[PDB]
Design a protein around this ligand. Structure first.
Ligand SMILES: *[C@@H]1O[C@H](CO[C@@H]2O[C@@H](C)[C@@H](O)[C@@H](O)[C@@H]2O)[C@@H](O[C@@H]2O[C@H](CO)[C@@H](O)[C@H](O)[C@H]2NC(C)=O)[C@H](O)[C@H]1NC(C)=O
Ligand SMILES: *[C@@H]1O[C@H](CO)[C@@H](O[C@@H]2O[C@H](CO)[C@@H](O)[C@H](O)[C@H]2NC(C)=O)[C@H](O)[C@H]1NC(C)=O
Ligand SMILES: [Ca+2]
Ligand SMILES: [Cl-]
Ligand SMILES: [Mg+2]
Ligand SMILES: [Zn+2]
Length: 608
């Protein structure tokens, strides 16, 4: 490591730790910036040379973290928890956690290789036919979303899970062992305990379960309503009105979001859909204007505009020069207090306008906490960033807001269109809740050893049926590794944050709507042009992770805890309607025939 980047001499007391932390920040910004810039250069210009430069930068960052982490532990391990400065305790406490840097040199290289291999297996997995082959993006995704042929959906679902999961299993086993070995040296019983420690809650798992108990009735009613609709479409041979739903029929490879089957379940189909896409096109909107419109939403709250560096450096539309890029939208903090960017192959549609606002919500977060020490430039807990992005989108998606920005002449007030709106939202927000909760329950069991490799798939499908009420549409056994067929598993990205953020965002919404002086149905609230809501946002965002998330949340919503009631209050109208619908049809809530699996279609897979 360059001598100017490794730590010098510092004294083993709090005053010395302040100097240590300031010197850490100076070098850390350089290291962090070069890593983000190298990822940016690759993700906006995918070449092998750029991929190589990115790996160089990542390994420099790892080397930096180990050098400063070992120094921090040598000097402050027995004393940092008694420092009087709480932000210093947060900084030092993070620096002394080495993760994979605790592994012997060859194991550390193996750990990094496993991460790269697992990521590559997932991104190149494909489903071949009895011939060309399909890729997850966009081939299989579009089949799951729009095909209504049971056997076709089945072929894509089975093909993908076998292709992505099976080769991952031997690697995931080795990753699990090395990951645990590394974090045991940081003082954690296993990797899952380290992930959970980010929430700094002695009763995190109990708190989560109590939350889900309050949410489960809404999911069960949505599940039974949708299961009825599927029964009408595919018949009694493939749909058990008292059993789990076959996992490939909900519009999504993982059945985590059901909005792609909205057309089957529309409460009131005779009402016009809400889609202002064509009006955007007639008004001449393009990607840049969409971002300027999003920017004006933030300035209307007296939040910060996008700085010139954002407009100069961002990739707001797919480059015309034929460059290969990552088109999925993402927001970038370069950790130099200067460069902040969005990378998105923006298209001119209503849904994309909502995404622009969401992603700019991430940028606004970055800009508000950019004067904090680098270690504290993150959300108050790992679920805050998505919750901030999503709460802004909750306002911007309403017909009320679309009217105000010139995209919808007349706002209807018939209750039937309200139900349609809420049911569409529920297919996205409520259907996801069991999946967001269960993924890390599976990984926590794997990390702790309660789920050895011999029961990876058994415990995966236990959780999937228990919470989502689905079953695999073909028989599975322990040669299959269906957890591996979800991006975040081989790419080792924690997941409970997303369940947390789905709860949080409705807590945020209620608080901000009240601060905005809004009165009426929560799902019609738009905080646009409320400087009082903007002030309340500003105080959460500028805090970064400098303070306990429970206290930041208390200042914002008046409660120091996650709470499911604001979500239930948002959806109360459609929850009521679903209950009535299910009781009119005499539905069984749940899946009492838990052993049920559907049969294979005749002569599978010689089909169209
Ligand atoms: C585990 O399953 C594999 C895969 O077989 C498929 O999945 C099963 C659950 C079942 O639905 C089968 O009908 C499917 O074909 C089994 O490996 C297959 O074994 C058969 C013998 O019946 C053999 O002819 C195939 O060549 C095998 N297929 C592959 C891809 O290897 C395996 O036997 C099952 N049991 C165990 C313990 O692994
Ligand atoms: C995309 O990345 C490639 C690198 O892989 C860039 O090509 C390099 O361009 C510089 C000049 O900027 C040359 O000095 C190098 O010799 C080039 N490398 C190769 C392998 O040809 C390319 O310019 C980038 N494209 C854009 C639009 O930024
Ligand atoms: Ca997503
Ligand atoms: Cl998390
Ligand atoms: Mg959406
Ligand atoms: Zn986001």
């Amino acid at each position: 490591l360059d001598p100017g980047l490794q730590p010098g001499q510092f004294s083993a007391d709090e005053a010395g730790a302040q100097l240590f932390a300031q010197s850490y920040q100076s070098s850390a910004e350089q290291v962090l910036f070069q890593s983000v810039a190298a990822s940016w250069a690759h993700d906006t210009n995918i070449t092998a040379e750029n991929a190589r430069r990115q790996e160089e930068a990542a390994l420099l960052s790892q080397e930096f973290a180990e050098a400063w982490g070992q120094k921090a532990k040598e000097l402050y391990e027995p004393i940092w928890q008694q420092f009087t400065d709480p932000q210093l305790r947060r900084i030092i406490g993070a620096v002394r956690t080495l993760g994979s840097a605790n592994l012997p040199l060859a194991k550390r290289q193996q750990y990094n290789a496993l991460l790269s291999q697992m990521s590559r297996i997932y991104s190149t997995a494909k489903v071949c036919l009895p011939q060309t082959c399909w890729s997850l993006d966009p081939d299989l995704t579009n089949i799951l979303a729009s095909s209504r042929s049971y056997a076709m959906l089945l072929f894509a679902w089975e093909g993908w899970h076998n292709a992505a999961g099976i080769p991952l299993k031997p690697l995931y086993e080795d990753f699990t062992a090395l990951s645990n070995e590394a974090y045991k040296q940081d003082g954690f019983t296993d990797t899952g305990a380290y992930w959970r420690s980010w929430y700094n809650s002695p009763t995190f798992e109990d708190d989560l379960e109590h939350l889900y108990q309050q949410l489960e009735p809404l999911y069960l009613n949505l599940h039974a309503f949708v299961r009825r609709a599927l029964h009408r479409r595919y018949g009694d041979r493939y749909i058990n009105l008292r059993g789990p739903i076959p996992a490939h029929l909900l519009g999504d490879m993982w059945a985590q979001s059901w909005e792609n089957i909205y057309d089957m379940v529309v409460p009131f189909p005779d009402k016009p859909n809400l889609d202002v896409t064509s009006t955007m096109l007639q008004q001449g909107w393009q990607a840049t204007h969409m971002f300027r419109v999003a920017e004006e939403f933030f300035t209307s709250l007296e939040l910060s505009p996008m700085p010139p560096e954002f407009w100069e450096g961002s990739m707001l539309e797919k480059p015309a020069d034929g460059r290969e890029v990552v088109c999925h939208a993402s927001a970038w903090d370069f950790y130099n207090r200067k460069d902040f960017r969005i990378k998105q192959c923006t298209r001119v549609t209503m849904d994309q306008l909502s995404t622009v606002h969401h992603e700019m919500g991430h940028i606004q977060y970055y800009l508000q906490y950019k004067d904090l020490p680098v270690s504290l430039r993150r959300g108050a807990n790992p679920g805050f960033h998505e919750a901030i992005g999503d709460v802004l989108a909750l306002s911007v998606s309403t017909p009320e807001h679309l009217h105000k920005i010139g995209l919808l002449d007349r706002v209807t007030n018939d209750t039937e269109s309200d139900i349609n709106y809420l049911l569409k939202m529920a297919l996205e927000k409520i259907a996801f809740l069991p999946f967001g909760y269960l993924v890390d329950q599976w990984r926590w069991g794997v990390f702790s050893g309660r789920t050895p490799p011999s029961r990876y798939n058994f415990d995966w499908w236990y959780l999937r049926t228990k919470y989502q009420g689905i079953c695999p549409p073909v028989t599975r056994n322990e040669t299959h590794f269906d957890a591996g067929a979800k991006f975040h598993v081989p790419n080792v990205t924690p997941y409970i944050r997303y369940f947390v953020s789905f709860v949080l965002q409705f807590q945020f919404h209620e608080a901000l709507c009240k601060e905005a002086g809004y009165e009426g149905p929560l799902h019609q609230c738009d905080i646009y042009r409320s400087t009082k809501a903007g002030a309340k946002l500003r105080k959460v965002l500028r805090a970064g992770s400098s303070r306990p998330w429970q206290e930041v949340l208390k200042d914002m919503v008046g409660l120091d805890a996650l709470d499911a009631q604001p979500l239930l209050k948002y959806f109360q109208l459609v929850t009521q309607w679903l209950q009535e619908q299910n009781q009119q049809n005499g539905e069984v809530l749940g899946w009492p025939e838990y052993q049920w699996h559907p049969p294979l279609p005749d002569n599978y897979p010689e089909g169209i």
